Design a protein around this ligand. Structure first.
Ligand code: HEM
Length: 291
């Protein structure tokens, strides 16, 4: 399977910075969602789930085709709750009908991270919508009740190594688990709509307790009211993972730089960019624009 990136006709940087600003402005405006967390967390979750279907062996899935717009992917049990992110982006797509679905879903993830004061993420245009029959089947996204061996093995399919996996999991500092979407409940920390290295700090400094929640699933709970998934707590149980957790808990700039590289790689897996394609765009935030 080859997927070649094709720039939307005649569009350049200024066009995509308008779509960025439109998403960032609505992120500011619709601030009440999910008890004032806002839409930032569910939009980086949506960008990860539309990319997270990729398989390195036959180049199926991934962000290229925008196939989440089809019933089979939209109704995957693993995507429960993401309908809220889709409905948020739907007005913006009406306003910019020329952007492809894969491009809008991955740009939503980039815009949320930067607007929640995370690192700049270079982004490239050119994903092309593909037919309903290219939609990946359900079951390619990871389970949360497993151990380190499972996480390592699962991420080899998206060829992410240990460092890339631990950097990517730092996004669980954002938002929260919702019992009715996944069978888990609670936030992982106090700052859950600002991008920081708090996931690593909380994993190493909180007193975690294995308890059973109302959906009868086990999760790790702390006195402070925070929670960790079995697959989150895995990162301090494995010796390779644990030393990278300690490195990011002690250096927030190295975490930001490594997250940026692994999140761009995640969003670009499976896509072939021609050498006459434009360079990655670095978008300015509203704050840097005085908007
Ligand atoms: C083994 C890996 C992973 C598993 C099993 C996993 C699982 C989960 C689960 C069960 C939730 C709660 C969903 C809900 O109830 O609403 C969640 C939320 C979230 N995840 Fe993951 N995840 C993984 C990796 C990642 C990665 C790599 C990213 C992003 C780069 C990510 C970003 C998020 C975000 C931002 C939320 C919060 C969503 C919200 O507040 O609505 N996840 N994760």
């Amino acid at each position: 399977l080859v997927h070649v990136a094709s720039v939307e006709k005649g569009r350049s940087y200024e066009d995509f910075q308008k779509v960025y600003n439109a998403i960032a402005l609505k992120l500011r405006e619709d601030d009440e969602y999910d008890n004032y967390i806002g839409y930032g967390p569910v939009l980086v979750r949506l960008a990860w789930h539309i990319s997270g279907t990729w398989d390195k062996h036959d180049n199926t899935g991934g962000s290229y085709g925008g196939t989440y717009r089809f019933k089979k992917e939209f109704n995957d049990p693993s995507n429960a709750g993401l309908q809220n992110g889709f409905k948020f982006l739907e007005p913006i797509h009406k306003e910019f009908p020329w952007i492809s679905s894969g491009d809008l879903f991955s740009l939503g993830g980039v815009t949320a991270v930067q607007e929640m004061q995370g690192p700049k993420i270079p982004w490239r245009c050119g994903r092309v919508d593909t037919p309903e029959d290219t939609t990946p089947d359900n079951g390619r996204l990871p389970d949360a009740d497993k151990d380190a061996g499972y996480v390592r093995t699962f991420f080899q399919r998206l060829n992410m190594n240990d460092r890339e996996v631990v950097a990517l999991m730092g996004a669980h500092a954002l938002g929260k688990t919702h019992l009715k979407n996944s069978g888990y409940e609670g936030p992982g920390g106090a700052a859950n709509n600002v991008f920081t290295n708090e996931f690593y700090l909380n994993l190493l400094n909180e007193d975690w307790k294995l308890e059973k929640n109302d959906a009868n699933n086990e999760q790790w709970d702390s006195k402070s009211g925070y929670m960790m998934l079995p697959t989150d707590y895995s990162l301090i149980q494995d010796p390779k993972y644990l030393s990278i957790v300690k490195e990011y808990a002690n250096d927030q700039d190295k975490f930001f730089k490594d997250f940026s590289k692994a999140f761009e790689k995640l969003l670009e897996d499976g896509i072939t960019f021609p050498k006459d394609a434009p360079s990655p765009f670095i978008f300015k935030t509203l704050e840097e624009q005085g908007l």
